[PDB]
Design a protein around this nucleic acid. Structure first.
Length: 156
DNA sequence: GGAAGCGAAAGTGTCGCAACCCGAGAGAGGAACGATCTCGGGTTGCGACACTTTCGCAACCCTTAATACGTTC
């Protein structure tokens, strides 16, 4: 059963319960606005508690490769290390990506899985739909194809 | 992604003005018939402008969030 079997073994729940939960999982999100520091608002989609636990279990079960140049969302590394990497230099080229989190789609995720140069955990073709439902958020109720990563989630 | 309003941008029709044409008419001259200038419609071309269509800004935040204190995405 692969992914669902491991999720059941971690959450101490039946396969049927998790499978029934992972039907509208891309839709079980609570969206809200936080105030910007100067003016305006920022919209965040946060999943429900059960989906949050499912995402945490999925993240801890499968270890995707990460690079040493990345400094966000890893243990023992953070703002201080990122700043100290360029501390001794003379010139910098800070640059940003346009709408980073909402531009990531399941197509991108599956393209990156297959061609990754490092070790990648093996996902059976039967559970790819469950992977997409677990990891990705679905804005717009009518559109079931639009699946994007949500900035702010245990798995994003 | 995109309510509801609204306005930008671009394309298309329209409608009034000018410019000209053409027939009617009173009657200059000088001895009659009708030159010549004007009146009244009528047609066409043209360009400014009104009207028409499409696009795009960005409400809300969906059932579904957490709430020691601070930076960062």
């Amino acid at each position: 059963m692969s992914v669902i079997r491991g999720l059941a073994a971690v959450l101490r729940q039946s396969d049927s319960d998790i499978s029934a939960f992972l039907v509208t999982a891309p839709r079980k999100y609570k969206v809200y606005k936080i105030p910007k520091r100067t003016t305006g608002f920022r919209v965040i989609a946060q999943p429900a508690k059960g989906l949050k636990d499912i995402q945490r279990a999925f993240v801890q079960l499968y270890s995707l490769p990460v690079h040493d140049a990345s400094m966000a969302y890893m243990k023992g590394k953070g703002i201080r290390d990122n700043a100290a990497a360029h501390a001794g230099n003379q010139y910098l080229l800070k640059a940003d990506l346009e709408d980073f989190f909402n531009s990531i789609t399941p197509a991108i995720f599956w393209r990156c899985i297959e061609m990754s140069s490092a070790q990648t955990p093996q996902f059976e073709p039967q559970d790819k739909l469950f992977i997409e439902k677990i990891l990705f958020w679905q804005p717009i109720k009518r559109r079931k194809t639009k699946l994007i990563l949500s900035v702010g989630a245990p798995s994003s």
